[PDB]
Design a protein around this ligand. Structure first.
Ligand SMILES: OC[C@H]1O[C@@H](O[C@H]2[C@H](O)[C@@H](O)[C@@H](O)O[C@@H]2CO)[C@H](O)[C@@H](O)[C@H]1O
Ligand SMILES: OC[C@H]1O[C@@H](O[C@H]2[C@H](O)[C@@H](O)[C@@H](O)O[C@@H]2CO)[C@H](O)[C@@H](O)[C@H]1O
Lengths: 134, 134
């Protein structure tokens, strides 16, 4: 389906909320939500949120000068092929809160400063009904 | 018809999201969402979100020492009788962002210090499905 890419020219502040509503295809493998620091290829990523249906896992990480940081994995997979989903990604001064459904799924401490974030990206095996930045 | 009242023993910070999902009765006059700083009757209100189906308006305000403050009004009423709704109240360093539907509605700029808030209440003419604090 069409992916999402949107600029955040001033960055984001504690209280920024990214809301993604969609539907994991019935034969999906994996999709992702990126908060990048530029339009450049493989740019630094303050957050990489990667639900993996094929391997039954959800990986969190950051990227800096082309090398990945230490992965963090959440408890379980709050996604199912063929089911719709609602994701909130909430920026605090300490980290990102990943809310799936009606419960917080994981908390990802910042590695890159918030003010360096300048681009949001949503793609993969995912059908998107709405992407909003509040 | 049941009202929601839950304590925030650790308070709220920037990056906190208050999600409310419910339905407005077909005979509703008003319902309210309050962020109070204690369980006192007539406690100080850092925020008071008051949709009104009878006078067709949405009022924001703050209470301090029993006295209401300056009233702020949103553009229109994104609520209807006999219709479901979703409301996001997002706390940041500057104020509270009120989102209704899938669109930013209004921004209430802080009056009380955010650290005062220790309690959440939802009452009035409203039928609640979920009230989550992320
Ligand atoms: O961490 C984000 C990236 O992970 C890469 O895959 C990891 C894999 O998760 C890990 O288990 C091991 O196999 O090494 C790989 C990288 O070192 C993904 O390929 C990449 O797309 C990101 O998701
Ligand atoms: O909204 C704060 C309080 O307003 C009270 O009614 C106000 C009214 O909104 C205002 O237009 C003016 O006429 O003074 C009235 C009395 O303060 C509500 O009765 C109260 O519940 C609060 O909502």
């Amino acid at each position: 389906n069409v992916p999402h890419k949107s600029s955040l020219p001033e960055g984001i502040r504690p209280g920024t909320v990214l809301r993604i509503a969609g539907l994991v295809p019935p034969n999906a493998s994996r999709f992702h939500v990126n908060l990048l620091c530029g339009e450049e290829q493989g740019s630094d990523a303050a957050l990489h949120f990667n639900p993996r249906l094929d391997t039954s896992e959800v990986v969190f990480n950051s990227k800096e000068q082309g090398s990945w940081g230490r992965e963090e994995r959440g408890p379980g997979v709050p996604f199912q092929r063929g089911q719709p989903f609602e994701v909130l990604i909430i920026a605090s001064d300490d980290g990102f809160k990943a809310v799936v459904g009606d419960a917080q799924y994981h908390h990802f401490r910042h590695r890159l400063p918030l003010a360096r974030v300048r681009l949001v990206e949503v793609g993969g095996d995912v059908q998107l009904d709405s992407v909003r930045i509040f």
